[PDB]
RNA sequence: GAAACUGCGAAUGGCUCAUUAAAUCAGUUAUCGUUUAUUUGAUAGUUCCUUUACUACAUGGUAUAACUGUGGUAAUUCUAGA
RNA sequence: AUUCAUAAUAACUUUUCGAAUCGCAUGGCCUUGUGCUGGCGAUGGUUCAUUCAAAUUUCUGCCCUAUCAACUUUCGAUGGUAGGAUAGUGGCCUACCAUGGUUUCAACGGGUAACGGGGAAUAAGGGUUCGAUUCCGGAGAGGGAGCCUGAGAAACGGCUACC
């Protein structure tokens, strides 16, 4: 699953591939603008506050 | 032997285009016709011009030969003649060279391909590069 | 047709332009302006077909956009600007002035004039009304609006415009016994004097006009323009002085010139 | 001087004659029954956030293309986020 | 010929407009300021007028057919009043009311291998036949309908839906 992630106070952006769909469910059933918790998102995302901003489906 | 004997008729001075315009009738018995370059150099000494401010075109030969009727322009200077002459006539006289250009269909197809691109196209060039790379 | 038309086909242009049939499909369509398009002469038609100063449209445009030509004191770089009846066009180079008036055959003749009379023009009063703030104004035939007119000025009167400052100089009343000029119909180009005007309530007042050679005709009020008094006009007239010589009369004179 | 915003144009032109028989159209009228970009000529000294905001007129601020960079889809003059 | 143009009084208003725009040359003056005053453009803008138009509109004039004689009107047909809608008049639409309107001087219906006209062919005269087609007017953009933008489109080298 691709993750186009941006840090905008310094204008940086990068893509992740976060597999193991049994833990991606923090994003599931969540709309644009809602807040997820990065603790379950990954081990390196300790204390990050990710806001949903968009995305592209298959096709 | 030749007896080109150029005659000039219907001369108006037109300083609006800063030129003189006239019909030119050539009597060339025992000859096919007279070249436009020869007309230009003849009218050059007729009007004390520089031979590049003189332009001629038209020049229909009458039936049976011996006489031809055409059009002539004598401008006041070379650059001023350059500003008002058509590009094809300037190329005809060598004062200008024809520009390099593809055919009209080629230009139209290029423009239609240009319509299908928004922006410069460098963004999409690198995006399609990184996609078709795998 | 979903909006206004922008092209004028050849054979649908007014016949007095004398455009030749075979040179193309289109005539210069006059733009919107001071005169109705049926009663206008495009500057391109005047400068190319009348004066032969230009050979084609591109040279017409090159003349116009360099401001060598000015109409009513203004440049008008537009190729098809609708010049019209009695308008004075100044071409400062060559020091030439023209008044655009029809010859007696119903087509605009090239009328050479001096500078002093190139300085002014005449306007036929088309309307008299009270504007905003109760200010009267007159409307001329060329769409000019002149505020504060003389109260004696009425409809179908004539005014003289200074043409450098569009201000009223003097007027002429529409009355019996005064030289007029027919500006439409088959009497276009005729010059004569009012005999009498017939009323005909409900439309199209008629006027009876007598020529210099005592030739009498009648015409609609809409097409009658006052230019001055008998034998003293405010406009120089072109060759012929609006007489309408008959066919055999033109024949014997034209042989007098050429065929002897 | 590419790209893009703004403005204008894209309702012209060209093609065709399917429909259509008081319809279209023609000549002749009317608008004292209306809309009218454009051209042209005129035309606007009167404005205290649309009053305790006399807290700039020597001149207000916000928000976006193009662009930079990270991307999706086989594919469209598709476009997402920063 | 106007309850016209105007002009006045009283108020009203998701308060419209009444220049925060640009190029070139940049002079003249007094008050030792980078002060005052400066041209010619350009674009824009409210009403009026003009112009290019559009919309509606008066009268008169269309081929064949009765093996089409009655048609229209409950579902607007004809007219009235009021309102709504429109740029505006108007059954354009709505409510109420009246029973009207067309027709053997051919209504209505049917057919057209009918777009209309300027015109074309032939023709002593009178006529007959043709006119999809170089100009003018109309209509359409596979068939219908709807609509955004815009001064102007029910647009199709615009969009939306159905077939």
Distances (CA, A) of B89 to B6, B42, C49, C217: 21, 18, 23, 55
| Number of separate domains in chain C | 3
Question: Are C125 and C84 within one domain?
Answer: no
Q: Classify residue C22 as exposed, middle or buried by CB count within 10 Å of its CB (0-12, 13-18, 19+).
A: exposed
Backbone dihedral region for residue B3 (phi beyond 0: left; psi -120 to 50: alpha; all else: beta): left
Instruction: Give the whole-angstrom CA distance, residue C225 versus residue C182.
Output: 6
| C53 belongs to a structural domain | yes
For chain B, say whether C94 makes contact (Cβ under 8 Å).
yes
A7: helix, strand or coil: strand
Question: Are C106 and C34 within one domain?
Answer: yes
Quote the distance between the C-alpha of residue A29 and its chain's center.
13
For chain C, say whether B14 makes contact (Cβ under 8 Å).
yes
Q: How many helices (H) and strands (E) does chain C have?
A: 4, 20
Answer for the pair C168, C161: CB distance below 8 angstroms, yes or no: yes
Q: What's the CA B18/C1' D64 distance, rounded, in angstroms? A: 52
The position carrying tokens 């300085």 is: C119
Question: Are C46 and C106 within one domain?
Answer: yes
The position carrying tokens 């190729």 is: C79
Q: Which residues are registered as beta bridge partners of B76? A: none
Question: Are C89 and C134 within one domain?
Answer: no
Question: Are C150 and C181 within one domain?
Answer: no
| B62 belongs to a structural domain | yes
Method: cryo-EM
Instruction: Give the whole-angstrom CA distance, residue B27 versus residue B3.
Output: 8
| Alpha helix (H) residue ranges in chain B | 36-46, 78-84, 87-93, 104-115, 122-132
| B131 belongs to a structural domain | no
Domain containing C148 equals 121-171
Q: Which helix (H) or strand (E) holds C232?
A: strand C232-233
| B32 belongs to a structural domain | yes
Quote the distance between the C-alpha of residue C57 and its chain's center.
24
Residues 6+ apart with CB under 8 A from A8: none
| C7 belongs to a structural domain | yes
| B128 belongs to a structural domain | no
Answer for the pair C219, C185: CB distance below 8 angstroms, yes or no: yes
DSSP E strands: which ranges in C54-93? 69-71, 82-84, 88-91
Quoted resolution (Å): 2.4
Assigned token pair, C174: 């529409």
Question: Are C82 and C7 within one domain?
Answer: yes
Nucleotide nearest the Cα atom of C26 (by C1'):
D13
Contact B/C (≥3 CB pairs under 8 Å): yes
N residues, chain B: 134
Domain containing B111 equals 5-115
| B130 belongs to a structural domain | no
Answer for the pair B53, B74: CB distance below 8 angstroms, yes or no: yes
N residues, chain A: 59
Question: Are C1 and C106 within one domain?
Answer: yes
CATH of the domain at C227: 2.30.30.30
CB atoms under 10 Å from CB of A27, counted, come to 16
DSSP E strands: which ranges in C148-222? 158-161, 168-172, 179-182, 191-198, 206-210, 216-220
| C74 belongs to a structural domain | yes
CA trace torsion C97, C117, C233, C170 (10° rounding):
140
CATH of the domain at C1: 3.10.290.10
CATH of the domain at B22: 3.30.70.3370
Instruction: Give the whole-angstrom CA distance, residue C166 versus residue B75.
Output: 40
- Show which of C69, C100, C116 is a domain's final residue: C116
Parallel/antiparallel/unpaired status of strands A12-17 and A2-7: antiparallel
CATH of the domain at C148: 2.40.50.740
| Number of separate domains in chain B | 1
- Show which of C69, C91, C116 is a domain's final residue: C116
* Residues 134-153 (C) near nucleic chain E, CB < 7 A: 134, 139, 142-143, 145
Do the Cβ atoms of C52 and B12 come within 8 Å? yes
- Minimum CA–CA partner of B83 in chain C: C62
Question: Are C37 and C101 within one domain?
Answer: yes
Q: Which residues are registered as beta bridge partners of B57? A: B71
């Amino acid at each position: 699953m691709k993750l186009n992630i941006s840090y905008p106070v310094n204008g940086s952006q990068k893509t992740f591939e976060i597999d193991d769909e049994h833990r991606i469910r923090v994003f599931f059933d969540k709309r644009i603008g809602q807040e997820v918790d990065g603790e379950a998102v990954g081990d390196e995302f300790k204390g990050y506050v990710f806001k949903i901003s968009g995305g592209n489906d298959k096709q | 032997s030749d007896a080109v004997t150029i005659r000039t008729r219907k001369v108006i001075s037109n300083p609006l285009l800063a030129r003189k315009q006239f019909v030119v009738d050539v009597l060339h018995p025992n000859r096919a016709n007279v070249s436009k370059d020869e007309l230009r150099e003849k009218l050059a000494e007729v009007y004390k011009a520089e031979k590049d401010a003189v332009s001629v075109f038209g020049f229909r030969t009458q039936f049976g030969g011996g006489k031809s009727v055409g059009f002539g322009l004598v401008y006041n200077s070379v650059a001023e003649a350059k500003k008002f002459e058509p590009t094809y006539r300037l190329v005809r006289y060598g004062l200008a060279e024809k520009v390099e250009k593809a055919s009209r269909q080629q230009r139209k197809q290029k423009k239609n391909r240009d319509k299908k691109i928004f922006g410069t196209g460098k963004r999409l060039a690198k995006k399609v590069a990184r996609r078709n790379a795998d | 047709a979903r909006g206004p038309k922008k092209h004028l086909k050849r054979l649908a242009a007014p016949h007095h332009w004398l455009l030749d049939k075979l040179s193309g499909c289109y005539a210069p369509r006059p733009s919107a302006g001071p005169h109705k398009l049926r009663e206008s002469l495009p500057l391109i038609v005047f400068l190319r077909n009348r004066l032969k100063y230009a050979l084609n449209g591109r040279e017409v445009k090159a003349i116009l956009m360099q401001r060598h030509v000015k109409v009513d004191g203004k440049v008008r770089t537009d190729t098809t600007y609708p010049a019209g009846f009695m308008d004075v066009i100044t071409l400062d180079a060559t020091n030439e002035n023209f008044r655009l008036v029809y010859d007696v055959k119903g087509r605009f003749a090239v009328h050479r004039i001096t500078d002093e009379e190139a300085s002014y023009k005449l306007g036929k009063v088309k309307k008299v009304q009270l504007g905003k703030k109760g200010v009267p104004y007159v409307v001329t035939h060329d769409g000019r609006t002149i505020r504060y007119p003389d109260p004696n000025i009425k409809v179908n009167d004539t005014v003289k415009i200074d043409l450098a400052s569009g201000k009223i100089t003097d007027f002429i009343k529409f009355d019996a016994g005064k030289l007029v000029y027919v500006t439409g119909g088959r009497n276009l180009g005729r010059i004569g004097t009012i005999v009498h005007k017939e009323r005909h309530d409900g439309g199209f007042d008629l006027v009876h006009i007598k020529d210099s050679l005592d030739n009498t005709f009648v015409t609609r009020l809409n097409n009658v323009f006052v230019i001055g008094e008998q034998g003293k006009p405010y406009i120089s007239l072109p060759k012929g002085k609006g007489i309408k010589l008959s066919i055999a009369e033109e024949r014997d004179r034209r042989r007098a010139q050429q065929g002897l």
